[PDB]
Design a protein around this nucleic acid. Structure first.
Ligand SMILES: [Zn+2]
Lengths: 71, 247, 50, 53, 84
RNA sequence: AAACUUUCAACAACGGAUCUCUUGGUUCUCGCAUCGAUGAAGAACGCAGCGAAAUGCGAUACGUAAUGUGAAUUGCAGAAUUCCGUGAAUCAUCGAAUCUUUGAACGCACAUUGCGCCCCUUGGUAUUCCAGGGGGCAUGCCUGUUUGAGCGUCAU
RNA sequence: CUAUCUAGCGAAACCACAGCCAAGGGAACGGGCUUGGCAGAAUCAGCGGGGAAAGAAGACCCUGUUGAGCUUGACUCUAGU
RNA sequence: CGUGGAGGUCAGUGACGAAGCCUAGACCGUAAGGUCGGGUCGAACGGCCUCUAGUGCAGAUCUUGGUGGUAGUAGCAAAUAUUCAAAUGAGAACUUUGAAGACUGAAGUGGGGAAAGGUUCCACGUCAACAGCAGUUGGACGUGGGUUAGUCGAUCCUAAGAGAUGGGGAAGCUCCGUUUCAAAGGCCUGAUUUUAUGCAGGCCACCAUCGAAAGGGAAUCCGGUUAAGAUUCCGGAACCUGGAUAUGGAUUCUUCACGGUAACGUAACUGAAUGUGGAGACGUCGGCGCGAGCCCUGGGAGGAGUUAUCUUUUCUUCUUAACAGCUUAUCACCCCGGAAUUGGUUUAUCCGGAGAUGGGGUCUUAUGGCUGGAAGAGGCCAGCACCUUUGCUGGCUCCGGUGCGCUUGUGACGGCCCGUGAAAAUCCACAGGAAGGAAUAGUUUUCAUGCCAGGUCGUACUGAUAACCGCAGCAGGUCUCCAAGGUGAACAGCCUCUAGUUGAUAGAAUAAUGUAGAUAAGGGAAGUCGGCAAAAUAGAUCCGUAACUUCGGGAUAAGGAUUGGCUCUAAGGGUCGGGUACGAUCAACUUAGAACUGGUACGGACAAGGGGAAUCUGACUGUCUAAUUAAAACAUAGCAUUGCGAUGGUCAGAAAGUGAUGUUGACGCAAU
RNA sequence: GUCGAAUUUGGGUAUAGGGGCGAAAGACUAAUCGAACCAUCUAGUAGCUGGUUCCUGCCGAAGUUUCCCUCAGGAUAGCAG
RNA sequence: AUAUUGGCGAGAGACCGAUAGCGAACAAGUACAGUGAUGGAAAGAUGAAAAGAACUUUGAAAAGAGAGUGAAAAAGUACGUGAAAUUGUUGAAAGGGAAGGGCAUUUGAUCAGACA
């Protein structure tokens, strides 16, 4: 998932099971004060949900990951 | 013993009739104020072949008298009709092959078909391919007409009962032998599940009252009584005569 | 199957999390009668009927 | 790396190896038990056809 | 063959997971379960299966509410604030 | 003569008997009456700094609030006066709450995490469209209310 | 290609104790008893005489005051009509 | 006599060792059994008088647990087959790489999927167990990582069918029934200054709902990318649906477009109720036409192979997606015209005064062509650099031919039937003429452009001589798609290319008996219940064919001959100055014939009928005892009989305002 | 053996125990079918078969009479303690 | 006043003592089998305290031999005592197609006490 943060503007999160791609696009707007191009979603085989949200071309993914604190 | 295979038929469940490909219930149109006083005109749009019937159908269309609409009925088409012919329906209608007339209005000696027993059951008497009824006299007192039937039996019915005029199309269907079990199979593929009929004497004592024995015979007299019960009624049911008639 | 329903994917994800040995710090408690994970399934031996 | 998760919470790197080798044997005696006891009434069928005469 | 060559044709399930007792008994063609009849109101239970009520009666589960009723009776179904 | 075979003893092996234990059963007596539409019994999936199960619990998730006790928990890590204290704890009590998806199961459906509808609100040019939130929408029956039906029927 | 010999791996049926014969008597066809013939460790590959070899409380027959399938004008009833 | 417990007593024994257990050590008793020494061992236990019982084992094809002999034995033998070096390693027949040798051979041992499994996928560690030998490897053990959707599926609609409500049965769990004997609704604007709403003026009277990851169905393609994911990611290029919605164009001062004889045409070009019509929407077989992909193939531009000789050689790359524009046809249709001396015409015989042939047009756009997409991608080469991230620069990516080829899509037709071979959702169109509207205005959002949004769940991998079921890593079983070259009639068999595998315990020896495969002097069924088993014949071409017959057959009847190789000759087509005798010309594989030739061999391996004469029996094709019976039995068409005109025949239900035949009607149903 | 059809087959759905289904074998109905499987009444009943656990002492039989749907069994008399 | 083999809380026993007592003293209606209804086990004890064997050396490693803890590893997580079948080493003896047993003694081994 670090390859998706560094190459593309793709932030990867583990989201709660009841979220539906509008509650994730709006969460990253409200939590991180950014804009989101597009959210993708899969349900991991350990039964949790993983969301490939994607920042849009002027927000950078490395700066948001460093302000969060997982580098 | 088991229940025998003429007892297994009343439950249906494989023995019901195969009704995917049939057009609909072939019935005369209902008795209304147009059809008791005067006639009503309709046109044969097409002549179709329904599956599991030896006679073609006719899809006449009658305009709705009370609404602005078309109402399509299905008649059992009789010989000589064609698409685009006009079918006139009622008391004051003409007398040609295809019109439907109450049996008082037709003269004695005519032949009609698809007659109704009661005056409003929408036609259920002579319907198979080639069978008519022959009017053999009216009765202006008591309002009755007497007809004979395809079985040779004479029956007196109401005089307001309708019936289309002419012998039912399909004609001499049974003059041709099927020649193959593969042609009788497809005939019963669209009728119901009763075709390969195992003889009763081939069976065991459980399966049939005929069955069993170190030879193949019936054992007791094959003419069964009338007040016999469900499961004994195998063989001729109440045979007055039996055997070939003359020789 | 591949095209599977959610209430069997919810069941095979629980079986993934239960496909774990005993944690090794369990064997060090005071009255610890447990010695291995006896309800441990493997796809070769025992099919789960879900 | 979840290998340090062991090293802070009880278990050592050496204690895991001698612990699992006991543990992988504690399941060995039990499966040797299951094969031995069941082997009497496991050939005991119900509806055998006897293909002879 | 009716044995080994006919056990190979078994790849279509006839029961699936029940929704009210959660075990593979919900028969798909009948659309009714068979350990407890699920589209029915009352659960399926018979006194000839005395053992099969031990596995399913009151007490084999969490008892999320019923385990406190015996304590609440002793104090007398009281309410309100507690104490000092 | 050896080997081998058989017997016995010693020590070793296999194997788990015997003996001595026992937070478990069993039966007997005594006392009480306490499930659920205010959502039960049962189910499914979850939750711990390190848990797979058991026990506990429900997105407030090995618990919270309250009262009591008065210094632990402990496998490890961590946390220290929190120790003459509105205060430790996997403590007891328990009256305040939460209680996911379900289930008599209740918007319709359910082999579907399928599809609606009404209402207050928020956002996107927005009564109509999409979306996030909050609250509703089962059936039988009783009592009352309101609005109707019926040349059933009575005066006008 | 096996069998055979080697390295590795390694079961089962069966088994009172067991295992050389002749005649005798005997539950009337003995591996054991009685009288004789005799008889030398350990064994390997074959073999199908024997072990009334193994397989399964005889599937035939009889007995049971034991059943079941089936039949009919057996006895006693019964849905239906 | 012995045992488990109970009351009493010996102020019994005991950590200085109770109970237990062992002991070819001792003693007592006829015996059941009692006592003692030694060894072991570690927490309780006895004597005697009485009480009480779940109280004494060699057996029960006893029960549970444990262990033997057999026995280092039977065996680990189908699926063609393995070998050399090196690396890692304590250790190599078995792991990895390289070099050989081979096999599956395009109905694969290949590439994918539906069920079903469920983390087996993938990486890093690691070999106690499992992989019936081995192990350093593993579908194993240990820790982790991994499945991304507006277009792909579900969801949506209906099928055979399940099923609530109303009701009606039922002591009752519940049963019948699915529009039913029901008061079972929503919706257009007039209402639009209250928009509460009233008359509206009608309304689908069908009236739950579930039922298909193979039916119906709004819309996505190419290139890259990962240890493991792609129609999902990244990059480019599109389309659809639901919205709002402003420009441009259109139309309008006769308000709701013009052109063509016409079939019809276009960038647009108001249209409510209600009604009708189409699409969704359908069988199978046969040949024929066309298309796409593959195959074969010529020239040129590259790269590798062979080279003693020969070979302008053998192999290989030379590719274009959805979508959008312009165009392109059989069929059908319109106009002009008027046909016997009958013409037109298909492989297949149909069409014409109900208007052919002919001349001129119109349309559908399956499909093909050009162009955009798009060469910038991809492919093949050459060159020069290097950190690992990575490149960087030049070229080239071309023009054709061919056909009873193969697969497959489709078009126009033909054959068949007592068989005419699903339904809804959804979508559009017409008839209708309600309503509304122009001069800065409306209609336009079916014309072009522009703006926003497209949720939920599945997505890895296997799909089987190791991921499913068969107790297992079992020669069994399990639905489906694509499919190269040669031989040849062929998807036969045999050999090879792409791709995959080289896994199945091995080593030595070559006794008997086996199992699988072979061959035989002379005789040729003498064998045996019996020609069981094996052999013989077989392809093709030409010749020749009987009794019998339901005239179709019998029939590949029987029986006879030829077949290689090589050099040739003749016939059968297409395009062109000469068909209103002929000429160069490109391009098929087909048949017939003749010489010459050889150890008289030639369907040279593979593949591939034994035939005849009669009887018994069932007419045939078909079906059955899964796992001892495939038959003469069952079925069949044919024939005949009986029942019944619906207030009914045969059958069902505990019952019913219940059902099968019946969406039926004697040419039918039912029973034989 | 058959190989274009009374063909083969996937998925859906229908019929369930004295019932289903049957081109008929008493065949098939989850290795079960001349009546499935599971639980219960149930420790069904048996005049029939097998087994029946310590020692010593003393006494010590019967296979016969009569009746019995009686003849592999009982009652009764006998013998015995 | 009566019934109560379920629920909740108590008290008790001439009861059973891990093949017993409930199916379950233990992660027991658990693992596992069956499509399904249903079927359904086995499995308790180191020591007072883990003081669960630091270190040395042989081995590739498991392990071994020492050492060390302990009252005791003749208690080392295969853990109280640890019977028999069956098995190994050592010691004794016997043995021509079985072995075993009864009476009697020789020989070897072994045991013995009133007078000792
Ligand atoms: Zn259930």
């Amino acid at each position: 998932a670090m390859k998706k943060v560094e190459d593309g503007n793709i932030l990867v999160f583990q989201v709660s099971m009841k979220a539906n791609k509008y509650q994730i696009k709006k969460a990253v707007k409200e939590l991180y004060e950014v804009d989101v191009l597009k959210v993708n979603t899969l349900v991991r085989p350990n039964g949790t949900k993983k969301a490939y949200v994607r920042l849009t071309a002027d927000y950078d993914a490395l700066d948001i990951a460093n302000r969060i604190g997982y580098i | 013993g088991r229940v025998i295979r003429n007892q297994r038929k009343g439950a249906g469940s494989i023995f019901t009739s195969h009704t995917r490909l049939r057009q609909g219930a072939a019935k005369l149109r209902t008795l209304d104020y147009a059809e008791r006083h005067g006639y009503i005109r309709g046109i044969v749009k097409q002549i179709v072949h329904d599956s599991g019937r030896g006679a073609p159908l006719a899809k006449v269309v009658f305009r709705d008298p009370y609404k602005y609409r078309l109402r399509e009925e299905i008649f059992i088409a009789n010989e000589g009709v064609h698409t685009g012919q006009f079918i006139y329906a009622g008391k004051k209608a003409s007398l040609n092959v295809g019109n439907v007339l109450p049996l008082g209005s037709v003269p004695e000696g005519t032949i009609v078909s698809n007659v109704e027993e009661k005056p409003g059951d929408r036609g259920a008497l002579a319907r198979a391919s080639g069978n008519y009824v022959i009017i053999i006299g009216h009765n202006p007192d008591e309002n009755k007409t007497r007809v004979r039937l395809p079985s040779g039996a004479k029956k007196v019915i109401s005089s307001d009962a309708r019936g289309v005029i002419g012998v039912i199309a399909g004609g001499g269907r049974v003059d041709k032998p099927l020649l193959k079990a593969g042609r009788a199979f497809h005939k019963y593929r669209l009728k119901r599940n009763s075709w390969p009929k195992t003889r009763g004497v081939a069976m065991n004592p459980v399966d049939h009252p005929h069955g069993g024995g170190n030879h193949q015979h019936i054992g007791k007299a094959s003419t069964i009584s009338r007040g016999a019960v469900s499961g004994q009624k195998a063989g001729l049911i109440a045979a007055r005569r039996t055997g070939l008639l003359r020789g | 199957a591949a095209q599977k329903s959610f209430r069997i994917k919810q069941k095979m994800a629980k079986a993934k999390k239960q496909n774990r040995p005993l944690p090794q710090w369990i064997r060090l408690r005071t009255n610890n009668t447990i010695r291995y994970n006896a309800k441990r399934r493997n796809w070769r031996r025992t099919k789960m009927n879900i | 790396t979840a290998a340090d998760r062991r090293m802070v919470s009880g278990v050592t790197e050496k204690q895991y190896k001698k612990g699992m080798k006991k543990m992988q044997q504690l399941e060995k005696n039990a499966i040797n038990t299951q094969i031995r006891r069941e082997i009497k009434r496991v050939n005991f069928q119900t509806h055998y056809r006897d293909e002879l005469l | 063959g009716k044995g080994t060559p006919s056990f190979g044709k078994r790849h279509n399930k006839s029961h699936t997971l029940c929704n009210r007792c959660g075990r593979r008994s919900f028969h798909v063609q009948k659309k009714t379960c068979s350990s407890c009849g699920y589209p029915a109101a009352k659960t399926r239970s018979y006194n000839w299966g005395a053992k099969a009520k031990r596995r399913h009666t009151t007490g084999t589960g969490r008892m999320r509410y019923l385990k406190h009723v015996s304590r609440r009776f002793k104090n007398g179904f009281q309410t309100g604030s507690a104490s000092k």
